[PDB]
């Protein structure tokens, strides 16, 4: 449980001591942020400043924000080392039918900046995507594109990046929520504003205005419950053949009420599933762990965010704003 | 005055009883929202839940947001049935010189989803608009485009949609405001940040860079009061002939101070006009009813929003934020 | 120190008297706003209303926002006369390799609206920029483009506009801040989220996909301190030759921690430099005066904003939001 701090130049390293244990917070939100924040009061080299590394439970975080007030007090915000990949650019672009492996190779070919990667896909879920000018961006933006293109998640262990198809990210647990109303341990925002039961996927349109392939349709089994309601189609001008489009549609269709909540659950479990039972209507569906907030040096339980909201993290935060406002 | 509630499946229907009469709110804002919200406390089928219909004064509202707290309390927000047209998509697109009637026909040809429409235009104000790829969107977005293209308003009576030219939407009343300053019954934000007196309308430019027609200019009579000040021109690449452009310009020019206020007025009157007399300068101009907020089960007078702000509803809300802040 | 007010029509002019001296505020933020605001209580022509001119220390401000409450009180917000150039449009566009002088001439050729200009560049820093369709916009938007294209600042003296290369805007003062932590007189937000040490500049790409010239690279001397970290490149499709690109890159690279603070300093000094010494790491760099807030009729010292944040004024305000929140 010792925290280690090193200056950017790695000449001063020590155990961090003068920090507020109740301040100390580790926070993660799926594909948005992973950071630690804490407050230190002091009473003589530099160990903790901009660009210092802070080592906590086997992971490295780098000081990017730091306040100075005066004894003296500093409030640190340190994003996980993963986020430093944004310092890298791949200006070169490639076009063609490529695997995730070929794309990741493209990102890091000229300067890997200490990053490595692997793809875990033993069932061969993934397939090629037709890239057009893949590149000309910073490494993080490029990775984020791949996540969307291939239907994968990235799980950083320091600068080693593990990519997995969404299907094998998170396992079914034995946790479940029988939801009748909000409690101390579980509060949810639920709506049907985005409830849809059928969606189309369209590829490229030729110079004559004709489609390369007939659009793909994906229909939820909940079409029986709610009737046909059309989600905005996926339209991807790069696809001249269906490719992974069908799976893309199923990944995107919001065929259950958008449900986002903050819970205390009864280990690391990013992406793990909890069965959500919406009791008033007897409708059962999975919600996933999409965020956490830990105070590891206190007796507080981790605060977990569970969601099935496929739209966006901003849509998820809107729902949580309603949860917090009450 | 009985409210009726039916579940989505129409197997349970009843008179709604356990609701907070002071909570009960009907709100409308021109081309933005129309909803009811209320709170119900309970102490056994499902009647009121997601996708339930709530019938109030001859109109249908559908539960899309619902809170659950615990006795038990639920806060409902139910947009008018009109807004459910967004569940429909017209993926097909059409190009050509079309009437509003032809466009509306296009929207609902494959699946009307229970919607109908009519156009009331006895004076033949409306004309054709040159559409390019009209379609490929949800029904609400398409309708909103038509409102802008043709200079019309839509007035939903449940799923029956009445379209009217802006000229015959709202009549001149005998209400007037002699404005010297803000009172309990009328408070206004007024500015001249967007005050303009002349505007141009441009159509398509050809492959050589030449315009299909010379731009149309519309000059306010207030050019005598304020001098020439140029509004951002209308530019519409679809127009190869003037068409309805001149009228478009007059619909858009903000030739009076942008004036937005919340009033209590001394029936349904959406779009009706109130004469606004800006007393300090002796300048008279019309403001229109663009929103209301009713508490029908209380003795409170409807709160009305009057505006002549042609920019946007966000611009109108900015002004009201100033009214509310004081 | 007499304030003079004239109505828009210039028939009523007088010394302004019934105003709250503590209310009276002059505020400037670099290329964003320059205004006065004040409150007047009254107890009879119109002198002070919408479009009135308010003359303060040799500059003209025009009333655009005005509140009315009731004795009677009015809160005025009056942007500097410079901002009225937005009432002018240059619909015509030009393409070619042009000097700043040729562009400014283009803006004001048809109707100068009382504006004049001059360029002060005795060292001949400025050069031609390849314009494509320069024009078709309001005068302020066009000026703002030129500021970015040519690397210049505009310093309005009423409607006379002085343009200067960034190098000769602001001089080195003898003011310095030895920063260890925040005090009553100086509080700063500092981060390294945008810290970059190398950047590329790209021009036009031809029909075959090849660049007209090899990209230009600019490397900070701080690459020795922080390592190579790539900023988003400048990419300008108009450039078929390097032109002023190298200078553009140096103008844009954020090679020191983004540092924004509110200070009381110990005359007009827009753009003047203060040496910022970040004491904990012994890193010295310039910050510039980018905003002020004055209460000229009080004993309050001007509040100055110092920054070296090259991203945007919104990025600068974000940092100040952190300063204000604490």
UniProtKB/TrEMBL annotation, chains A, B, C:
<protein>
    <submittedName>
        <fullName>Protein gp18 [Bacteriophage A118]</fullName>
    </submittedName>
</protein>
<feature type="modified residue" description="N6,N6-dimethyllysine">
    <location>
        <position position="225"/>
    </location>
</feature>
<feature type="modified residue" description="N6,N6-dimethyllysine">
    <location>
        <position position="204"/>
    </location>
</feature>
<feature type="domain" description="Tail spike">
    <location>
        <begin position="82"/>
        <end position="320"/>
    </location>
</feature>
<dbReference type="Pfam" id="PF18994">
    <property type="entry name" value="Prophage_tailD1"/>
</dbReference>
<feature type="modified residue" description="N6,N6-dimethyllysine">
    <location>
        <position position="200"/>
    </location>
</feature>
<feature type="domain" description="Prophage endopeptidase tail N-terminal">
    <location>
        <begin position="3"/>
        <end position="80"/>
    </location>
</feature>
<feature type="modified residue" description="N6,N6-dimethyllysine">
    <location>
        <position position="293"/>
    </location>
</feature>
<feature type="modified residue" description="N6,N6-dimethyllysine">
    <location>
        <position position="198"/>
    </location>
</feature>
<dbReference type="InterPro" id="IPR010572">
    <property type="entry name" value="Tail_dom"/>
</dbReference>
<feature type="modified residue" description="N6,N6-dimethyllysine">
    <location>
        <position position="310"/>
    </location>
</feature>
<dbReference type="Pfam" id="PF06605">
    <property type="entry name" value="Prophage_tail"/>
</dbReference>
<feature type="modified residue" description="N6,N6-dimethyllysine">
    <location>
        <position position="294"/>
    </location>
</feature>
<feature type="modified residue" description="N6,N6-dimethyllysine">
    <location>
        <position position="196"/>
    </location>
</feature>
<feature type="modified residue" description="N6,N6-dimethyllysine">
    <location>
        <position position="325"/>
    </location>
</feature>
<feature type="modified residue" description="N6,N6-dimethyllysine">
    <location>
        <position position="270"/>
    </location>
</feature>
<feature type="modified residue" description="N6,N6-dimethyllysine">
    <location>
        <position position="180"/>
    </location>
</feature>
<feature type="modified residue" description="N6,N6-dimethyllysine">
    <location>
        <position position="109"/>
    </location>
</feature>
<feature type="modified residue" description="N6,N6-dimethyllysine">
    <location>
        <position position="164"/>
    </location>
</feature>
<feature type="modified residue" description="N6,N6-dimethyllysine">
    <location>
        <position position="250"/>
    </location>
</feature>
<feature type="modified residue" description="N6,N6-dimethyllysine">
    <location>
        <position position="322"/>
    </location>
</feature>
<feature type="modified residue" description="N6,N6-dimethyllysine">
    <location>
        <position position="311"/>
    </location>
</feature>
<feature type="modified residue" description="N6,N6-dimethyllysine">
    <location>
        <position position="21"/>
    </location>
</feature>
<dbReference type="InterPro" id="IPR044051">
    <property type="entry name" value="Prophage_tail_N"/>
</dbReference>
<feature type="modified residue" description="N6,N6-dimethyllysine">
    <location>
        <position position="266"/>
    </location>
</feature>
<feature type="modified residue" description="N6,N6-dimethyllysine">
    <location>
        <position position="300"/>
    </location>
</feature>
<feature type="modified residue" description="N6,N6-dimethyllysine">
    <location>
        <position position="128"/>
    </location>
</feature>
<feature type="modified residue" description="N6,N6-dimethyllysine">
    <location>
        <position position="39"/>
    </location>
</feature>
<feature type="modified residue" description="N6,N6-dimethyllysine">
    <location>
        <position position="10"/>
    </location>
</feature>
